Structure 1
Amino acid sequence: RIEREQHHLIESIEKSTQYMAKRRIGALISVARDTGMDDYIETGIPLNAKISSQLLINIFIPNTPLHDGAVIIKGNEIASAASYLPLSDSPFLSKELGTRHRAALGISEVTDSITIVVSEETGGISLTKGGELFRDVSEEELHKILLKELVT
């Protein structure tokens, strides 16, 4: 069932981001939707892998081949790792945030994707959507947002 994959995806993002937030591991996960992100998948290393919290964690371990860039989830697959996303040049984004946030903001400005960031500085979890940034969200807030936006 597609609903079982969607709840598994939400659960996979929740557990992986909690694990990386606790250890201040930077992360950048873009979930494609109606708007295609195929051009950005082509920039990364193709995985075409089943979604799991364990694989998402292993990708973002620092100083590893797959950690430098964005993971893109498409359908029920982790499509790619270490992909480029377009950077926002918006001057409204706080300068205390990192390039991952700028990339999450940039992709959200030109797609309808949902993008999750884990800051390697603070461990806070942020989300971008439609050019907006939800900064340092709680587990409860992250859960409700993913439920509302990823479950059809």
Structure 2
Amino acid sequence: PISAEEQMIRAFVKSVEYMSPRKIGALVAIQRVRTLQEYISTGIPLDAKISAELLINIFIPNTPLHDGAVIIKEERIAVTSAYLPLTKNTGISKEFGTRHRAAIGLSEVSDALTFVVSEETGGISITYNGRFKHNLTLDEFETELREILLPK
């Protein structure tokens, strides 16, 4: 048996392994200490158990659920399609998109852990406490998730 936190990290890694080489855009915000309820209220309610397969199905392009942010709360997908604050992007390379602006903006006003798969490049990135970590390998991505979510 393995924890819900462990299962959730495994699901994130597997979903990103699928989405990145396919350049499927994804935006997943994980609530930590600071409540994300104000943003959850803007999404489509799922209140679903997390699996790699559901995360992939959510982000498949041109589906009712793929635009906007998935928000995770207490090891459940509370909503999809939530609206996150967008950071100002003066001077930012053209390669980054609205998903990166939403992840950075959320990290500037909360302690949430947010990750992005770029629709433009398939790049993997994470925001946390105002820091932007981009062009991660899958293994570096997993290491960041574990360091933050399992700070053992």
- For the criterion TM > 0.5, the same-fold answer is yes
Considering only aligned residues, what root-mean-square deviation do their CA atoms show, in Å? 1.4
- Post-superposition Cα deviations, 1:4-56, rounded to whole Å, max 9, x if no partner, equal 00011111110001100011100000000011000101100000000100000
Bigger fraction of residues in helix:
1
Counterparts of 1:7 and 1:93, CA distance in 2: 34
Which structure 2 residue ranges, 5 or more long, are not aligned?
A: none
Shift of 1:90: 4.7
Kindly report structure 1 stretches of 4+ aligned residues shifted beyond 6 Å: none
The 5-angstrom pairing of residues 1-150 of structure 1 reads 4-91=3-90, 93-150=92-149
Counterparts of 1:17 and 1:26, CA distance in 2: 10
Counterparts of 1:53 and 1:25, CA distance in 2: 14
Shift of 1:96: 2.3
Percent identity between the aligned chains? 52
Matched-pair contact (CA < 8 Å) for 1:93–1:102: no
- Post-superposition Cα deviations, 1:72-104, rounded to whole Å, max 9, x if no partner, equal 000110000000000011536433200100000
SS of 2:99's partner is: helix
Task: Please report the TM-score for the alignment, with normalisation by the length of structure 2.
Answer: 0.95
Task: Please report the TM-score for the alignment, with normalisation by the length of structure 1.
Answer: 0.95
Counterparts of 2:107 and 2:135, CA distance in 1: 17
SS of 1:115's partner is: strand
Say how many residue pairs are matched.
151
- The aligned amino acid for 1:63 is N
Which structure 1 residue ranges, 5 or more long, are not aligned?
A: none
